[PDB]
Design a protein around this ligand. Structure first.
Ligand SMILES: Nc1ncnc2c1ncn2[C@@H]1O[C@H](COP(=O)(O)OP(=O)(O)OP(=O)(O)O)[C@@H](O)[C@H]1O
Ligand SMILES: Nc1ncnc2c1ncn2[C@@H]1O[C@H](COP(=O)(O)OP(=O)(O)OP(=O)(O)O)[C@@H](O)[C@H]1O
Lengths: 70, 113, 377, 248, 237, 239, 370, 233, 73
């Protein structure tokens, strides 16, 4: 299959992510714009609990980025 | 083997080539149509790549009949072919029934093409 | 439960029996002398020097040792490039050592002769003839080749469908070779250490060179790294080195000289191009599925041992076998006897074979052999 | 492997391309019909509802094919438009030749032979449309029919094709009564079956399209129920559920 | 093979034509048919190989009448043989219609071969016969020249044969024929010889149902369905 | 060689795509036929009632002409096309020759239509093996069967479809000159043979009879039950 | 409570297995032998009795041999035993095969004879003629002139109990049975794995009549495909060594091979050929008569109500395997225990079949189409 | 999932605790469990819960193939795992994946039932049953194929109560309505509604969770995807 | 010609025609055609090797093998 080996990686990561050391939580931050690894299972609460979408800087957000860089 | 032909069914869902054509439509200049109580207003973004291109030449919003107009999003060469065929079907209707083609019927005939 | 008790009682009786049952001059004077006798570890000499010889020897993994000759030795007897035994305590060459036999390479040599005549192989006269002048006639009568000034191919590759008879012919050549036959164990050539197998291949040729006129049978050439993808991972790198070592020793910078190589492969396509190239293997004797005259002959040879009615027609049975390898034809003969054993008839009849012909070919999922389609008649 | 050409036959005698198209009908709005003594009905799910879409066109999944026949389409949208036109053409062509409305089974057999041909000829893909036919003919009376992309057809007292067809068929088999459908009862069966098959909650009028064919004064009178008529049937089903409460 | 067998259009690097050879292979699936040509006449013998007791014997047609003076035996695909047999039957009658005379056995064999050759002409009836036919036909007839037997093959190649065998066991039959055949053989002697060879090369015993025999001789007409004499000749042998 | 392509041959010599078509016939419901002295009879199985589905539309046994009737086994739609073409030819044969179609002619016509699909790519070989039973003019009863390969054969009695081989083995022992002695005895032989592969359903049988002097009549379900009971009594008498 | 007697028999048997020197000659050898003795290969033999011996450290010093029992057994490649310090050959060479090979040998077969198996009688006949019959009555094969078939392959859908036939052969076999999975040749080291295949066969020849079972042969040999990516499985080399052992020069002596595969098409043609697998046995999914015997055997040792209809379950559902029948019987017993009835009602069997067959979904729209 | 838990108890707890009942019944003990759910909700919680309440050795082997013919080790994933389970006679092995073909075959031969001691119960818990091999699915190797459904409205209320046990819910909260508001939830989603709702309170710096906070969380956990003009069919 | 120099080749043999026939042949294969031709002549006992014997060598080196096939004659 070839693709199966990549799928095997997704399963292995999902098993580790499950519940990790509850209080000493190993927080995992993901910024991959890929639907193939974006299975519903990864998106399930208990895996990627919070989803934040980054909008293209608009007016006001751009003014802040420009002011800080200048 | 699927996604390379429109003559074969997807092994589960639908033929992918029509969906790829929709992708080309998506990569098109923005076109906005607003039906209103007393009329329909259609618009497109016509931006020449360079100042040299003349803005008075090829026209994106083109009349098909006195009361019927068409706007397009997608590959520009393909639009001219359907702009001609749609106009012709409107004329064939006038010759056969001596009435300007109804807008609903023209859309059905254009869709068949 | 009483029957179970009888077995338990039997076990108890055995337990009672076991408990009740419970209730040369070499080992003499020679041992007293033997324990003092010292050891001499083997090592290989690489050089010699003027005046004090100071021969320097690599032990085999230890170090280059500058060891003087032992007092009770002859300096002439010790020689450069000669295996020697050096006592660790006295640090001197007490006794020289004879050259290593390398027995594993010696083991591969057939030594025994397989008892199969060329007569038993059947339906491949042309394949036998091609092998005869690369294996028997050039060695037995080299004069004819010299008269035309034509060299023998000195190499043969036997390839064909499985069960054709390639190895059967090879054992037959071994029976009448009249020269050393060296069957090669393919797994033995692959070794745990890097290039350890490649060292063995050099030894294989060296053994072949020492004997005069010998044939080496590399059966299952695919096992001996018979491919050269040689990808970046280089998983087969150790085997690929072993394959190249065979190729160079086989031909180039002085080749076999008196060695004829016979290689047999079920899949010829997989074999690496350099090995396939001639000179390494000039002849390409492909074995083929037997024709109807061959199919009758293979049936007759296989069935000669079996007791059968004298009126059986092998020609009909061979015709009923459209494309059968020799092994499958042998399978029909054995299966026909098994049906007679099932019905307890000592002498088999033509019908028994026909049932076997259906069983060996049609009953197997060939699909073509079994016809449900009216299609053609 | 043995896919691609409708022409290739698998080693198990299976035309996968035809089978794939028949499976494909599932991704479509639910269409169901009940034979109904003294009537016949076709009900469809109006999927893809949006505030901007006008819905000016009368109907969307229900098309009349004759004065006395109608069909509901579930499948590829373009293929449906091709088939509906041909079905309308065959109906008038029979009337021109014999001056009598086409018997319902015949209109179905004719489209089915066209659908069948596409499967036997290499160049084209098998049709992706399956449809339900409601009509009245003098020879066999009120009838309901189903057509498949394979080109096979059948007459069903009740059947469903789009979306959760098995769920509707299971509900229909238990609820349906032979000879006692009595049109108004059949309309109720449809609203109840629709509620189960659709994941939609409350079965709002916009989501459902109901067409009823009856023979009145010797003339078939195919009618598509207006939203107000559909709304009253929905309220009655909701009230019946309220009556069921506590007792259930 | 090794590819280049996808169509008769492709040519092998060796220059051989695959597909034509594959059609020659199909004949082997056929039952053996033996034809012997003698001055008294041509004898055709075939192995009926009836599949089931229930099926009617007549429906399997291994020996057919092209015309009163010509008879044919087919080994290979049943449907393919029918198309070729019909052409020979139309052609013999058309030659009579145009020339008011009986077509020679060689000319019928030539005419049938012409359709067989069009495996892929690309001009004649396009969409028909895209592949080689899989049937070998033995045409035995008495013409003006005299008794003649002609063998056609799937590749359109035809030859006059004093004795010939087609189908499975053809190879075995031919070897037997070379020993048995002689120029002075009578038709009666040939008829006995053909069945004797057929019995040796057929697994089933040569009972009257198993073997169908045919004989065309100058004095008589086709007479190629010996009936109940199948029992008489077999018992005498 | 290759299975995929109707015209590519095989090194052994086989058009596999045609053989793959025969598989669809085997997956079809069992149908049997017998040749009777005056009552040629064909039997069908697997009525397979589907509860809310009308069974007038399912028509495994379809008549082609007054003297000839046919039963198909295989893909239902492909069968509908072949039956209609055979029906047109029967009428055309009457227009071209004013004599009713002999049974052999219609089987040869059905074989030719089937062969024409086999000959070229762009067409799928028809997946049906119809059994045609009728009495020709001159009142001779005949039974013929057509394979998807385009071959046709004449059979005293034959079975097609699922478990066809089992029915044929049963007929090989059962079919006798005595069995065709009486019109009822011939109907009984079809019922007995059909019962073996029809399971214990009994109701799942639709035997149809050709009088050879009259017209095809589908037997009434009650009439079929009476014959089934008579067979059970005869079996009890043998016990 | 007859279980106590059975438990006692098992404990007594273990005790029996647990309970299974010369005045001067042995003591002298005990003195001669070192407290620690290291076993090493023999490289060269010399008449003086000082013979070169290879070792892990490679000290090949010629060493004297003084073996009281016998010193004539020395051979090239023999594993001699040497003193830890003096390094002299102590005596008779150690004669033990590699540890991985020892695990395969099986002395006890849990299943009994062919009685437990039902409806595979044709399959039983083939295995017996190839395995049990030649040993029991060798004369018949010689008189026929046939050499007994030495190789068998059992190929069937999952749960047709191909392994059960192998377990039955183990119960009644004179021959030592070596049970090796095909997937037990994963040796990571280059080499070694093909050598292990050689080791299993050499042991089989040493034990004279022997039966080799290689369950799941698909892993060891499939396709013989090219290296492709260049990973190079080396499994193909392992399969080639097995192919060599079965019929690759020399002879196989008296060793019989039984091999079982769920899928036979994948297996490479060379391995599945006459001469390596002379007889081929096919296990089909059970029909009706075979199902009746299996259902009876599984329910034979359980409480059965008169109400239960074994025939109804077999006829109503077609496709269940022999293993599936056993699962229905175990599930039915659990279904009854829920109601606290040791006796099993017909209702329990009906519920049981439904629970076991919930994962088997097959077929698409192939109903109206044909 | 109470019915599912009882079936798991029957396959694992009942044979180990009472071997005699099976012998008296005449039925061999069930040795295989497969937990499959399309959402898959609860499959591990059952396996982890069995692990706390086991009284048997629990071995977890959710790892992939690093051993076998790779540079790693030989037969570690299957042959070694069973041998360790033999050392501890009451043992249950939980597998969270069908892996590399040679390894999967080795698992099948070990699970065939050559274990006379047995007392080894495999709680395989992998979704997408269709991909799994039929030989692994064969009843002798895996006796039961328990299915974990998406939680029903009653079940969602029960899961909501379990995860709202520590939360300070204000009086007037309707947990029942919140279960109804999210239909076809994945159970973990019900757990998510509580965690997100609590964070709304945490950002507002209050420990008093309110009905609105649960409703807003239901929307945040819920995800909706749509495309336009691809609505053909 | 270079390899066949030792062998008694007939003057009639034309190397250019043989070379045209041996398309895509490595030099060693060309040597092989010469070596095989010598053995082929030896099999028939020919004192000298004719051009046709060389042609047979080309087929044997290719492993093509030759026979009458019909559809050709
Ligand atoms: N032509 C033949 N004459 C006699 N026996 C034959 C012949 N061909 C095959 N056999 C039989 O087949 C077996 C010989 O097979 P052989 O040792 O030649 O290996 P092979 O199967 O051809 O080799 P490979 O497995 O590498 O393809 C014996 O049983 C032998 O009797
Ligand atoms: N009924 C429930 N009550 C409480 N929490 C639950 C419930 N079901 C699921 N959960 C929670 O949601 C998680 C979902 O586990 P789920 O079984 O879906 O995936 P997993 O942990 O990867 O296990 P597996 O791989 O076996 O599916 C549980 O681990 C648990 O935290």
């Amino acid at each position: 299959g070839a693709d199966r080996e990549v799928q095997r990686i997704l399963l292995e990561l999902l098993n580790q992510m499950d519940g990790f050391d509850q209080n000493v939580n190993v927080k995992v931050i993901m910024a991959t714009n890929r639907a193939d690894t974006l299975d519903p299972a990864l998106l399930r609460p208990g895996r990627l609990d919070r989803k934040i979408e980054f909008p293209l800087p608009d007016r006001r957000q751009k003014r802040l980025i420009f002011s800080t860089i200048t | 083997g699927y996604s390379f032909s429109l003559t074969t069914f997807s092994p589960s869902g639908k033929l992918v080539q029509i969906e790829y054509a929709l992708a080309a439509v998506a990569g098109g200049a923005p076109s906005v149509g607003i039906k209103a109580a007393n009329g329909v207003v259609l618009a497109t973004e016509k931006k020449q790549k360079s100042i040299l291109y003349d803005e008075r030449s090829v026209h994106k919003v083109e009349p098909i009949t006195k009361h019927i107009g068409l706007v397009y999003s997608g590959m520009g060469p393909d639009y001219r072919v359907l702009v001609h065929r749609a106009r012709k079907l409107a004329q064939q209707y006038y010759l056969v029934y001596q009435e300007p083609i109804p807008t609903a019927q023209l859309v059905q005939r254009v869709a068949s093409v | 439960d009483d029957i179970q008790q009888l077995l338990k009682k039997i076990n108890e009786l055995t337990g009672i029996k076991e408990s009740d049952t419970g209730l040369l001059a070499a080992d003499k004077q020679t041992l007293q002398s033997e324990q003092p006798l010292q050891v001499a570890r083997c090592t290989k000499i690489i050089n010699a020097d003027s005046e004090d010889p100071k021969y320097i020897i690599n032990v085999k993994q230890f170090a280059k040792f500058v060891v003087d000759l032992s007092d009770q030795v002859a300096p002439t007897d010790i020689e450069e490039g000669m295996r020697v035994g050096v006592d660790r305590n006295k640090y001197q060459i007490h006794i020289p050592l004879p050259p290593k036999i390398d027995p594993t390479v010696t083991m591969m040599q057939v030594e025994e002769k397989p008892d199969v005549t060329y007569s038993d192989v059947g339906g491949c006269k042309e394949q036998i003839e091609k092998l005869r002048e690369v294996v028997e006639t050039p060695l037995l009568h080299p004069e004819r080749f010299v008269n035309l000034g034509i060299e023998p191919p000195k190499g043969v590759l036997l390839f064909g469908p499985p069960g054709t008879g390639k190895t059967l012919c090879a054992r037959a050549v071994a029976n009448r070779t009249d020269a050393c036959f060296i069957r090669v164990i393919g797994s033995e050539l692959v070794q745990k250490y890097v290039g350890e197998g490649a060292r063995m291949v050099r030894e294989l040729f060296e053994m072949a060179r020492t004997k005069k006129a010998c044939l080496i049978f590399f059966d299952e050439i695919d096992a001996i790294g018979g491919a050269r993808f040689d990808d970046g991972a280089g998983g087969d790198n150790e085997v690929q080195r072993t394959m190249l070592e065979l190729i160079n020793q086989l031909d180039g910078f002085d080749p076999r000289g008196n060695i004829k190589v016979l290689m047999a492969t079920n899949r010829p396509d997989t074999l690496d191009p350099a090995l396939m190239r001639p000179g390494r293997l000039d002849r390409k004797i492909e074995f083929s599925l037997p024709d109807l005259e061959g199919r009758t002959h293979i049936f007759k040879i296989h069935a000669r041992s079996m007791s059968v009615e004298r009126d059986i027609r092998f020609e009909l049975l061979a015709r009923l076998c459209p494309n059968s390898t020799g092994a499958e034809i042998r399978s029909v003969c054995t299966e026909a006897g098994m049906f007679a054993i099932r019905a307890r008839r000592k002498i088999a009849t033509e019908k028994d074979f026909l049932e076997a012909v259906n069983k060996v070919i049609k009953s197997y999922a060939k699909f073509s052999a079994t016809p449900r389609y009216m299609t053609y008649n | 492997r043995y896919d691609s050409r409708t022409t290739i036959f698998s080693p198990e005698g299976r035309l996968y391309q035809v089978e794939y198209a028949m499976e494909a009908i599932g991704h479509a709005g639910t269409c169901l019909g009940i034979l109904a003594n003294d009537g016949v009905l076709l009900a469809a799910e109006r999927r893809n509802i949006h505030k901007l879409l006008d819905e000016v066109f009368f109907s969307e999944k229900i098309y009349k094919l004759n004065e006395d026949m109608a069909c509901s389409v579930a499948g590829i949208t373009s293929d449906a438009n091709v088939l509906t036109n041909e079905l309308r053409l065959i109906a008038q062509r029979y009337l021109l030749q014999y001056q009598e409305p086409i018997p319902c089974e015949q209109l179905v057999t004719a489209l089915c032979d066209i659908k069948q041909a596409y499967t036997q000829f290499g160049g084209k893909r098998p049709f992706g449309v399956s449809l339900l036919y409601i009509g009245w003919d003098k020879h066999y009376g009120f009838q309901l029919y189903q057509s498949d992309p394979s080109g096979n057809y059948g007459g069903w007292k009740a059947t469903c094709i789009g979306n959760n067809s098995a769920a509707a068929v299971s509900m229909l088999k238990q609820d349906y009564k032979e000879g006692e459908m009595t049109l108004k009862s059949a309309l109720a069966l449809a609203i109840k079956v629709l509620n189960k098959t659709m994941d939609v909650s409350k079965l709002s009028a916009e989501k459902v399209e109901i067409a009823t064919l009856t023979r009145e004064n010797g003339k078939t009178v195919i009618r598509v129920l207006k939203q107000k008529e559909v709304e009253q049937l929905i309220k009655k089903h909701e009230e019946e559920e309220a009556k069921a409460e506590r007792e259930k | 093979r090794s590819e280049y067998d996808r169509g008769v259009n492709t040519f092998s690097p060796e220059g051989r034509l695959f597909q034509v050879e594959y059609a020659i292979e199909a004949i082997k699936l056929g039952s053996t048919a033996i034809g012997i040509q003698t001055s008294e006449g041509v004898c055709l013998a075939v192995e009926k190989r009836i599949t089931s007791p229930l099926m009617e014997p007549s429906s399997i047609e291994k020996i057919v009448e092209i015309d009163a003076h010509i008879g044919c035996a087919m080994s290979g695909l049943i449907a393919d043989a029918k198309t070729l047999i019909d052409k020979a039957r139309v052609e013999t009658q058309n030659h009579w219609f145009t020339y008011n005379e009986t077509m020679t056995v060689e000319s019928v064999t030539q005419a049938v071969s012409n359709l067989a050759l069009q495996f892929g002409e690309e001009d004649a009836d396009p969409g028909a016969m895209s592949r080689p036919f899989g049937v070998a036909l033995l045409f035995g007839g008495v013409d003006e020249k005299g008794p003649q037997l002609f063998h056609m093959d799937p590749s359109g190649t035809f030859v006059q044969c004093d004795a010939r065998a087609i189908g499975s066991a053809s190879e075995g039959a031919q070897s037997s024929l070379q020993e048995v055949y002689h120029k002075s053989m009578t038709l009666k002697e040939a008829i006995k010889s053909s069945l004797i060879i057929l019995k040796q090369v057929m697994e089933e015993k040569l009972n009257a149902t198993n073997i169908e025999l045919a004989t065309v001789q100058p004095g008589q007409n086709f007479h190629m369905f010996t009936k109940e004499e199948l029992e008489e000749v077999i018992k005498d042998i | 060689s290759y299975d995929r392509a109707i015209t590519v041959f095989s090194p052994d010599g086989h058009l596999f795509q045609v053989e793959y078509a025969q598989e669809a016939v085997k997956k079809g419901s069992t149908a049997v036929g017998v040749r009777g002295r005056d009552i040629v009879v064909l039997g069908v199985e697997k009525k397979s009632v589907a509860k809310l589905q009308d069974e007038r539309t399912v028509r495994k046994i379809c008549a082609l002409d007054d003297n000839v009737c046919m039963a198909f086994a295989g893909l239902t739609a492909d069968a509908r096309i072949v039956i209609n073409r055979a029906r047109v030819e029967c009428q055309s044969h009457r227009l071209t020759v004013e004599d009713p179609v002999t049974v052999e002619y219609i089987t040869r016509y059905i074989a030719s239509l089937k062969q024409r699909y086999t000959q070229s790519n762009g067409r799928r070989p028809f997946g049906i093996s119809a059994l045609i039973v009728g009495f020709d003019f001159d009142g001779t009863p005949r039974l013929y069967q057509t394979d998807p390969s385009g071959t046709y054969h004449a059979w005293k009695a034959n079975a097609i479809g699922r478990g066809a081989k089992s029915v044929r083995e049963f007929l090989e022992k059962n079919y006798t000159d005595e069995a065709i002695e009486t019109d009822d005895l011939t109907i009984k032989l079809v019922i007995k043979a059909l019962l073996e592969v029809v399971q214990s359903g009994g109701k799942n049988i639709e035997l149809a009879v050709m009088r050879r002097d009259q017209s095809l009549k589908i037997l009434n379900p009650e009439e079929i039950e009476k014959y089934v009971a008579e067979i059970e009594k005869e079996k009890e008498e043998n016990e | 409570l007859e279980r106590i007697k059975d438990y006692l028999l098992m404990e007594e048997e273990f005790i029996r297995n647990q309970e299974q020197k010369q005045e001067e000659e042995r003591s002298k050898v005990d003195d001669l032998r070192g407290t620690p003795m290291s076993v090493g290969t023999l490289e060269e033999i010399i008449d003086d009795n000082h013979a070169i011996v290879s070792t892990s450290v490679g000290s090949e010093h010629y060493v004297s041999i003084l073996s009281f029992v016998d010193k004539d057994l020395l051979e090239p490649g023999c594993s001699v035993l040497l003193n830890h310090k003096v390094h002299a050959v102590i005596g008779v060479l150690m004669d033990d095969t590699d540890p991985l090979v020892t695990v395969m040998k099986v002395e006890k077969a849990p299943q009994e004879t062919y009685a437990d198996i039902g409806g595979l009688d044709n399959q039983i006949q083939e295995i017996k003629e190839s395995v049990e019959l030649p040993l029991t009555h060798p004369e018949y094969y010689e008189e026929m002139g046939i050499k007994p078939p030495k190789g068998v392959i059992l190929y069937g859908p999952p749960g047709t109990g191909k392994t059960l036939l192998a377990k039955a052969v183990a119960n009644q076999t004179s021959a030592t049975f070596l049970r090796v999975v095909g997937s037990e040749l994963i040796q990571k080291y280059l080499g070694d794995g093909p050598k292990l295949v050689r080791e299993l066969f050499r042991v089989a020849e040493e034990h004279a009549p022997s039966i080799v079972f290689i369950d799941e042969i698909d892993a060891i040999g499939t396709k013989r495909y090219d290296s492709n990516s260049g990973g190079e499985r080396e499994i193909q080399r392992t399969m080639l060594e097995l192919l060599n052992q079965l019929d690759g020069f020399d002879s196989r002596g008296d060793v019989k091979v039984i091999m079982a595969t769920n899928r036979i098409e994948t297996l490479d043609p060379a391995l599945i050929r006459p001469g390596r697998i002379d007889r081929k046995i096919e296990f089909p999914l059970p029909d009706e008569k075979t199902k009746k015997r299996i259902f009876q055997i599984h329910t034979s040792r359980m409480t059965l109500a008169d109400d239960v209809t074994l025939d109804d379950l077999i006829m109503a559902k077609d496709d269940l395997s022999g293993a599936d029948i056993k699962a229905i019987c175990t599930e039915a017993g659990l279904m009854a225990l829920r109601e606290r009835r040791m006796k099993v009602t017909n209702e329990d069997f009906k519920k049981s079949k439904e629970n076991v067959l919930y994962k088997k979904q097959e077929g698409t729209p192939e109903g109206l189409y044909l | 999932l109470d019915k599912q838990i009882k079936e798991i108890k029957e396959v694992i707890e009942l044979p180990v605790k009472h071997p005699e009942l099976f012998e008296a019944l005449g039925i061999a003990q069930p040795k295989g469990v497969l937990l499959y759910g399309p959402p898959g909700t609860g499959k591990t919680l059952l396996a982890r819960a069995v692990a706390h309440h086991t009284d048997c050795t629990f071995i977890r082997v959710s790892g992939s193939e690093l051993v076998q013919k790779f540079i790693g080790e030989g037969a570690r994933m299957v042959r070694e795992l069973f041998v360790m389970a033999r050392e501890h006679a009451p043992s249950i092995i939980f597998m969270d994946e069908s892996e590399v073909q040679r390894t999967m075959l080795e698992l099948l031969n070990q699970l065939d039932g050559f274990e006379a001691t047995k007392n080894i119960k495999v709680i395989m818990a992998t979704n997408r049953i269709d991909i799994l091999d039929s030989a692994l699915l064969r009843p002798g190797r895996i006796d039961r194929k328990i299915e974990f459904p998406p939680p029903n409205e009653e079940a969602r209320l029960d899961i909501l109560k379990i995860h709202s046990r520590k939360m300070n819910l204000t009086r007037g909260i309707n947990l029942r309505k919140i279960a109804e508001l999210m239909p076809g939830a994945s159970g973990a989603e019900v757990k998510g509604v509580c965690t997100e709702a609590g964070m709304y309170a945490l950002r507002e710096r209050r420990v008093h969770v309110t009905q609105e906070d649960f409703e807003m969380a239901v929307a945040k956990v819920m995800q909706k995807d749509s495309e336009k003009n691809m609505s053909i069919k | 010609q270079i390899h066949s120099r030792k062998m008694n080749v007939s003057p009639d043999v034309n190397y250019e025609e043989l070379a045209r026939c041996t398309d895509d042949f490595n030099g060693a294969q060309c040597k092989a055609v010469c070596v095989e031709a010598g053995m082929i002549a030896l099999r028939r006992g020919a004192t000298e090797l004719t051009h046709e014997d060389y042609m047979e060598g080309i087929l044997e080196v290719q492993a093509k093998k030759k026979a009458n096939l019909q559809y050709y004659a």
